[PDB]
Scaffold this active site. Structure first.
Site, PDB file in Angstrom:
ATOM      1  N   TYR A 149     -34.531  16.972  -8.254  1.00  0.00           N
ATOM      2  CA  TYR A 149     -35.777  17.671  -7.146  1.00  0.00           C
ATOM      3  C   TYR A 149     -37.099  17.036  -8.348  1.00  0.00           C
ATOM      4  O   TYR A 149     -36.626  16.737  -9.614  1.00  0.00           O
ATOM      5  CB  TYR A 149     -35.045  19.179  -7.974  1.00  0.00           C
TER       6      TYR A 149
ATOM      7  N   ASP B 141     -32.123  12.713  -3.749  1.00  0.00           N
ATOM      8  CA  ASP B 141     -32.859  12.065  -5.047  1.00  0.00           C
ATOM      9  C   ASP B 141     -32.501  13.403  -5.850  1.00  0.00           C
ATOM     10  O   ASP B 141     -32.841  14.296  -5.385  1.00  0.00           O
ATOM     11  CB  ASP B 141     -33.115  11.161  -4.985  1.00  0.00           C
TER      12      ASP B 141
ATOM     13  N   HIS C 268     -30.669  16.579   6.393  1.00  0.00           N
ATOM     14  CA  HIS C 268     -31.355  16.941   5.084  1.00  0.00           C
ATOM     15  C   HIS C 268     -31.171  18.203   5.433  1.00  0.00           C
ATOM     16  O   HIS C 268     -32.525  18.909   6.578  1.00  0.00           O
ATOM     17  CB  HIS C 268     -32.201  16.197   4.414  1.00  0.00           C
TER      18      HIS C 268
ATOM     19  N   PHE D  43     -29.053  19.748  -5.888  1.00  0.00           N
ATOM     20  CA  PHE D  43     -29.824  20.246  -5.704  1.00  0.00           C
ATOM     21  C   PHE D  43     -29.372  21.202  -5.811  1.00  0.00           C
ATOM     22  O   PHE D  43     -29.760  23.807  -6.338  1.00  0.00           O
ATOM     23  CB  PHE D  43     -28.838  21.280  -3.935  1.00  0.00           C
TER      24      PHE D  43
HETATM   25  N1  LIG Z   1     -34.553  16.736  -1.833  1.00  0.00           N
HETATM   26  C1  LIG Z   1     -33.240  17.278  -3.051  1.00  0.00           C
HETATM   27  C2  LIG Z   1     -33.221  17.970  -3.619  1.00  0.00           C
HETATM   28  N2  LIG Z   1     -32.513  18.326  -4.462  1.00  0.00           N
HETATM   29  C3  LIG Z   1     -31.342  17.396  -4.719  1.00  0.00           C
HETATM   30  O1  LIG Z   1     -30.668  17.137  -5.775  1.00  0.00           O
HETATM   31  N3  LIG Z   1     -31.143  16.703  -3.663  1.00  0.00           N
HETATM   32  C4  LIG Z   1     -31.994  16.335  -2.918  1.00  0.00           C
HETATM   33  O2  LIG Z   1     -32.376  16.163  -1.935  1.00  0.00           O
END
Ligand SMILES: Nc1c[nH]c(=O)[nH]c1=O
Ligand SMILES: [Cl-]
Ligand SMILES: [Cl-]
Length: 228
Positions: free
Chosen positions: A71, A69, A192, A82
């Protein structure tokens, strides 16, 4: 606005067709976000960025990266998983870990900033399993309806007469694996990159060079992963 305008206005042409099965669901998510604001809760990324990953061409995707999901810090999420704006520093921790692995795997120097748009522009889809989050509250929009949307995106990608490599980072991303079963698709799964899980197998996972080996073995061009 996702509530107000159709997919043909919101996302790139190939994506608008790919996401046809979830057109009503996307409008529903716009209604959810409206209800959040009415109730006194906010969301990230900004509304205009929520579907940004689907503004790069569907037919050009060669690699799929899926995280959990967006930040949770206001000013970080930009609608590409990310990625952060070029002026953001310090980098979020999961991005610092991604870049650590990028240098170890590929031998490139650390990137100058956290902007992953070059990857998006080169056929890497930067998806999250869930496309919004309440500020400061990771996973707060899990189970609110985005999963059907990202499931549809993955099925559509997998149904193309084209090669695809998927990189699934973490447990929520991993729930897309069953949909990635057809012979034109290959999946790399790892923990992750967040500090909570990265030492369970993210570091040393070499996803970038593995993805390129997989692409070349399907007769596709590798990704140029090099960031400035
Ligand atoms: N931990 C996260 C940070 N930001 C992202 O876009 N996705 C992720 O899973
Ligand atoms: Cl809030
Ligand atoms: Cl509240």
């Amino acid at each position: 606005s996702m509530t107000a305008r159709p997919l043909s206005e919101l996302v790139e042409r190939g994506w608008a067709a790919a996401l046809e099965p979830v057109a009503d669901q996307v409008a529903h998510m716009g209604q959810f976000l409206r209800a959040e604001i009415a109730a006194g809760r906010r969301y990230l990324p900004a509304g205009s960025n929520v579907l940004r990953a689907f503004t790069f061409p569907f037919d050009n995707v060669r690699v799929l990266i899926v995280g959990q999901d967006p930040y949770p810090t206001p000013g970080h999420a930009v609608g590409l998983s990310f990625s952060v704006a070029p002026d953001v520093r310090p980098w979020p921790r999961s991005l610092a870990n991604i870049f650590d692995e990028y240098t170890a795997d590929l031998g490139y120097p650390l990137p100058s900033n956290g902007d992953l748009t070059p990857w998006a522009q080169r056929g890497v889809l930067l998806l999250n399993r869930v496309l919004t989050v309440r500020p400061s509250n990771p996973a707060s929009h899990r189970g609110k309806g985005w999963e059907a949307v990202t499931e549809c995106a993955i099925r559509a990608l997998a149904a193309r007469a084209a090669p695809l490599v998927a990189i699934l980072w973490g447990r929520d991303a991993s729930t897309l694996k069953p949909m990635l079963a057809a012979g034109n698709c290959v999946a790399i799964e790892s923990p992750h990159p967040s500090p909570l899980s990265a030492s369970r197998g993210f570091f040393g996972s070499r996803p970038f060079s593995r993805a390129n080996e997989l692409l070349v073995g399907m007769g596709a061009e590798p990704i140029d992963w090099r960031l400035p």
